[PDB]
Amino acid sequence: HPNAATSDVNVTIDTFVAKLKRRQVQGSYAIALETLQLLMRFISAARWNHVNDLIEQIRDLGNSLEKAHPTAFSCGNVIRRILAVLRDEVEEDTMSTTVVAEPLISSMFNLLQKPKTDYRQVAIQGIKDLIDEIKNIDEGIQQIAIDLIHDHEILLTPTPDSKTVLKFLITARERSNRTFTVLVTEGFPNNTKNAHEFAKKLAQHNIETLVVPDSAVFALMSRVGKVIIGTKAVFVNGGTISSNSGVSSVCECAREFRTPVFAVAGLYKLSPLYPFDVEKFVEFGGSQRILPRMDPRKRLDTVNQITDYVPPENIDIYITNVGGFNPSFIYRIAWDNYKQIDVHL
Amino acid sequence: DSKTVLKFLITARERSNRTFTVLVTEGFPNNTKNAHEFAKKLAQHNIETLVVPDSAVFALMSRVGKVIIGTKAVFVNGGTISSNSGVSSVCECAREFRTPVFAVAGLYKLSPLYPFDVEKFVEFGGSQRILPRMDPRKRLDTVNQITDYVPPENIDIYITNVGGFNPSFIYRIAWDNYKQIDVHL
Amino acid sequence: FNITETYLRFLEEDTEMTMPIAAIEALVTLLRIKTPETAAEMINTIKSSTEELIKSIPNSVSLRAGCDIFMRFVLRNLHLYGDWENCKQHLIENGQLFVSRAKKSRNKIAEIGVDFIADDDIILVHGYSRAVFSLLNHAANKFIRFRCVVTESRPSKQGNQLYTLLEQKGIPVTLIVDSAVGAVIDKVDKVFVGAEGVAESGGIINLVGTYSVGVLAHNARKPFYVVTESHKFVRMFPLSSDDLPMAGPPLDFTRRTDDLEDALRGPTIDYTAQEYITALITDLGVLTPSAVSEELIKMWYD
Amino acid sequence: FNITETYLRFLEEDTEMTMPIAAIEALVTLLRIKTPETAAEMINTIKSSTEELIKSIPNSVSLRAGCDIFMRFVLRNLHLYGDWENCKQHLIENGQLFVSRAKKSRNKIAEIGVDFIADDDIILVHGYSRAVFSLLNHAANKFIRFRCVVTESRPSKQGNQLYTLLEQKGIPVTLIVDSAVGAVIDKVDKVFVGAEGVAESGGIINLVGTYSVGVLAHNARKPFYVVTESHKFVRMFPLSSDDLPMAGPPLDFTRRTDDLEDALRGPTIDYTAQEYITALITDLGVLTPSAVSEELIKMWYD
Amino acid sequence: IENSVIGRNCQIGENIRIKNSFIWDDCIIGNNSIIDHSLIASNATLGSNVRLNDGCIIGFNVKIDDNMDLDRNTKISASPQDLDDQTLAVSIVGDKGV
Amino acid sequence: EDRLQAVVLTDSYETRFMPLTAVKPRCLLPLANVPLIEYTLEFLAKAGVHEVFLICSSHANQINDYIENSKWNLPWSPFKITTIMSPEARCTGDVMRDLDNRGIITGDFILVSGDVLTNIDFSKMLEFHKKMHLQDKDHISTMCLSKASTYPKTR
């Protein structure tokens, strides 16, 4: 399913594709915003009449988007949420049209046993809700953040690439009476400059900064107290896609040492589809960025990867804008945002 | 308690520029008085002392860097029987949280006899200083041991008059002063 | 109205229709005699039937679980509180409907669970479950990239049978013994285990060893799996390292002998914990972490 | 004259003989025929014979070790710088004497070094070794209260044999499945071993499934032990978790060829790491921590 | 196989050695064949027992059929003339063409 | 900065491919398992196109068919493909002459000879060009050159 039905209704699909491919769009937030705008455009223009057909169309669109790009997840998630929002309203409408509804609580056996129209405004409202959810993650976690780390204790911090993580760290640092030391690992071929920037910021912020070469983690692990993953995407079985490079090894080390591993992200980054593999999801960077030369470099096939995956084992807790969820619990949260038929397109 | 360990501590304290923090577990039965004496002695020179309850180790072990023991009996596979009161659980905790262990020892205090069973070598102790009067002792069953054995899975260094040795290696050291013949007679 | 006969009829059949399914069908048929409306006559009779089944059972809980599920379904049924005949009719219908559902479930599995196969990954299927085998077959049909491996299982020669079945396909086959599984740490890529019951959260009943396998996987940090269709949801939790209803005695130090009498005794049944398993495989969308427990909560409200 | 013939000679009896002791004796016998005064016509020939023996091996490991030990002994022998006759005579003598010493060592093991099973500590043993059984029998003799636990051996049905050998004493025993090894760690105390050879690295050269067992022991922190007549240090280094000089293929990947055939080739030899020996029962006094390595160093003067 | 590329709708029988290659649209890699630093173009197909070497350039409809041995840097004509080896059955080792 | 037309020299380097290029046009041949033209088009788009023009020659019917097939053909694209059809066989001077005769020539027009596909972001380059133009009236055309592995060998 490519572009064929779209005429003088929606054109921006191509622009979106372009943004995805050559990277003029940067940061997950921006992508989410773009997606929201696209959805708005869809809503204000497309022809409705029937409801099931509209739903089908939406599904098709989603499928097309998926086909176009995999590494973007926030975009997908937002769409899914909107679909879910639509679904409840649709159900309500159906219930009115038909006219027992609820026994005590939400119950199973629904998959075995047999279970003019307005919705545009509701769809619009859903988009607004999504926007609100997106607005600020840090303004919703920093109250459950200056609660874990304390005096004379030592942090270990990989991935300063996620914008949330840095902010969280800054919030933690704010206090005048409290004092703590921060270790920051690099992650060379994809995250060095960012790491340097983070270090500089820390220095500026009147805190005891420590520069770490990626090798020297082991000779300081005796003093290590906490581990924070700078993730960008979240999944079904609790797992997370990181904001690129140099996390996995550190996580493994922490696990070996049995040293606390916390996860900071957000529930807009939460996806309703399982990471069936890592190969289809995680992409590789540029082999040219490690070593120069070209003509004798046909022999020198060099390997470098951007994104990182962490198993549903090394992760422990996920404090969100709502609160502290867990790896063996996030499924329900996902369901609460994205509904049954909406997952499979 | 011993004058060796005390002397070592004094020597350590003499170079007071080194930042060392003293956490002393009381040791439920007999060790308490000895601990107090040690504390007093420390105070005599001016050394900071912090008193630790025996129940609370799990809430402290994640913070503690290095552990020093002044043991009496040293053994074959790397284990020790120390001068009484709660060591085993502490060691287990250390193993769980990964903590380095030092020991002030002597090769003359080291034994070439191997401890093979927990059922024999662990010495049970008196219930004289636990509960006053003996009428509740009819139905209840008080289980208590004074001196305890340590498994070699935990300690890693034995600082002696010669030097620091590996636990899974101390047998060689022992044999560099003792024999295989003088064991079973 | 007779269940022992039904039990006798089904033991090594399976293949076409799942063992539990047949039992469920039988239960439905039994229900559709004494009327589901008259709850005084019906529920007691159902209980009696369950008791009979238990009596006839040696080393299983799956059938019991199925009947409990059926009971739950029945309970759910009457929540329309209007016309009493339609509900009854629906109840009558849901028996062969359950059987039909199985096909659909299989189809679903053949679409969702076929995404897992990657470049050069060796697959080892544990125990006996039809669904897992079907999945494997569907993977073979897709021709991703794999290797189908069998075991030396010991109930009434199951592993051998499985191996023979695999041979039919043609895919090259090598075997793993119950003891010689220890060498497998990274070479066989992913550890798959078939299920004969799924409990609260991570609790799964199979055959003569799963817990050890799970432990091994944990040690190796290997991906561990539970693979099934849809008919096994139980409200159960054990206390010790292992606790189950048993016909074969645990640690039976056999009496003094010289000419052989009875010896083949030990832990015939095996359970698995929550921590060991990374992925749960069911047709019910894509659920993994602790969805079954939630489902149970939704159902029972007890 | 042949060492092979000598080896063939002993089959049904043995149980009393100890690996290299018989082999060593055979070697000695071979030596004391073709003039043991000279060194050019002798040592080289002995080496050649050993090589031939190695070539001829169906499935036996410790022979090489025995030969090496013999060589070492020979080397030790000629350092007195007196006369060729006396030393030669001594060499000739030292074979029967060595054999005799083995029995003494066994006796020592059975009377002094048997204080590991005394307080009804249930023993987890797999792999048929003679020393183990001697220890068992002499424990029974001393009346030193005990219970036995053995995992079922089914590559060639040695389990039955083991059971029979346990009926002679007259003490209740139980069957254990090697997949349900994770199921039972509850009442059984520690894991003890009867094996084939002692490694240069520290671990143990053993039969069908051992690594898993080791892992389980580690998980349970119930210490792992080895019971052997202590002169089976084979000149072999297991550098990895799955690489060794082996009698057969390492996890033989078989093709789908015929009907129910290429699967019974079970990996009947496996290994576990060096960080497992809490104690090893040796006849030179109870010495373990890094003892084998020390011995090796002493032998190769490095 | 070492560092070689296979194109669209190209069929492989059994037992083939390949080293450092690129292959275009619809080119059958025949039973027992070696492709080294050499290209095979659209509709041109390799049959049984062909031993190619470094830099063998192939054009349109070169039907490489049965038993051939081509040396290094050999160029083969394309369009359905100026260079040796032609479009018809078997490339030149024993003279065939018009 | 904005409104820039694309002119690409196609059907020119035939027979330079020593055996190939006679029946179907030079560019139509499948490159990396899929047609070469597409990559070039993508590159052009990235750079900044407002209308697509190619100077096709060798058997025009096939080119037309390709155009019909293509994605830039129907309304949705910001730029359409309408290839310049001229008399057979001519050099780059002659091609230029033909173009001039045809008429559609702009200020800052883009001319790429043959087919190219690379990574470097073109906006910056364009900006630099503009800056250079703003300096003096006498500024002409832009060259693209990149560094290699120290010594030359396969050149």
Residue numbers in the entry:
A (entry chain C): 10 to 108, 113 to 128, 147 to 376
B (entry chain D): 192 to 376
C (entry chain B), D (entry chain A): 4 to 305
E (entry chain I): 357 to 436, 455 to 472
F (entry chain I): 24 to 178
From the article:
The map obtained using a linear mode dataset only did not yield a high overall resolution (5.7 Å). To further account for the different conformations of eIF2 in the complex, we also carried out focused EM data classifications using combined dataset without applying any internal symmetry and we obtained another four density maps (maps A to D in Supplementary Fig. 1), however, at lower overall resolution. After the first masked classification, we obtained three maps A-C with conformations of eIF2γ tilted towards the PLD domains of eIF2Bγ subunit and distinct extended conformations of eIF2β. This conformation results in a slight rearrangement of the three domains in eIF2γ, compared to the TC structure. Also, the eIF2γ G-domain in this conformation is more disordered than in the TC, possibly reflecting a higher mobility of this domain in this particular conformation. In all three maps, the density for eIF2β allowed modelling of the zinc-binding and central domains in the conformation similar to the one in the TC, but with the zinc-binding domain only partially covering the nucleotide-binding pocket and extended central domain approaching the binding interface between the eIF2B γ and ε PLD domains. In this position, the ε-cat domain would not have access to the nucleotide-binding pocket on the eIF2γ-G-domain.
For multiple rounds of initiation to occur, the GDP on eIF2 has to be exchanged for GTP. The structure consists of two eIF2 molecules bound to opposite sides of the eIF2B hetero-decamer.
